[PDB]
RNA sequence: CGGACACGGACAGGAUUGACAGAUUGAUAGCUCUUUCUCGAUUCCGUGGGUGGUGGUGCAUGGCCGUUCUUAGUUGGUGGAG
């Protein structure tokens, strides 16, 4: 639960995401890829299909989470602020990151991956 | 585009750059078309707005110069006309 929280959250900061209209599709194939994320809310699940037969079989790592609604503020565009609208942006369904480059509290992160998928 | 910015939408389930091969070209300008690969939020689109101008106006101006002016001319400060 603590890796749900903020310990995913301590390096997203400004490594090599995911972002835009062609970049989380074009970016994964890279053997640079630490951990990633995967918004559990896609319409067809035949994108996330695609993932799942490219991260598996190699040492791509997910979490699972809800949506881009939410994670919309998540990935680098924040449109919720004391001027910016409700509605601005929409964040992405899979990012990734490629090099942390620093060790704040990431741990949890990676002492939760090889605790319960073994 | 070398149209800064302000606002609104379109933007990761598909905005925007680049580019070989073939008509397309005056031309190795992907200019544009044909099929497709590529860059990564940078931007594009409309809406207000700066900008650039060897664009007009020397009869709106400055500065500079030229001339009447290459000759000896010119002017105040406190002094006559019951």
């Given at each position: 639960?603590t890796?749900?929280q903020?310990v995913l959250?301590?390096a997203?900061i400004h490594?090599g995401?995911?972002?835009?209209?062609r970049?989380?599709a074009?970016?994964?194939?890279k053997?640079?890829?630490?951990?990633?994320?995967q918004?559990?809310?896609?319409?067809?699940p035949?994108?996330?299909?695609?993932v799942?037969a490219?991260?598996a079989?190699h040492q791509?790592?997910?979490?699972?989470?809800?949506?881009?609604?939410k994670?919309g503020e998540?990935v680098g565009?924040?449109?919720?602020?004391?001027?910016?609208?409700?509605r601005?942006v929409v964040?992405?369904?899979?990012?990734?990151?490629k090099?942390?480059?620093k060790?704040?509290?990431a741990?949890?992160v990676?002492?939760?991956?090889?605790?319960?998928?073994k």
């Amino acid at each position: 639960n603590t890796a749900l929280q903020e310990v995913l959250k301590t390096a997203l900061i400004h490594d090599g995401l995911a972002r835009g209209i062609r970049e989380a599709a074009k970016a994964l194939d890279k053997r640079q890829a630490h951990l990633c994320v995967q918004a559990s809310n896609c319409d067809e699940p035949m994108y996330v299909k695609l993932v799942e037969a490219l991260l598996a079989e190699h040492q791509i790592n997910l979490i699972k989470v809800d949506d881009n609604k939410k994670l919309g503020e998540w990935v680098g565009l924040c449109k919720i602020d004391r001027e910016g609208n409700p509605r601005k942006v929409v964040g992405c369904s899979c990012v990734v990151v490629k090099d942390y480059g620093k060790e704040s509290q990431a741990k949890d992160v990676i002492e939760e991956y090889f605790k319960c998928k073994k």
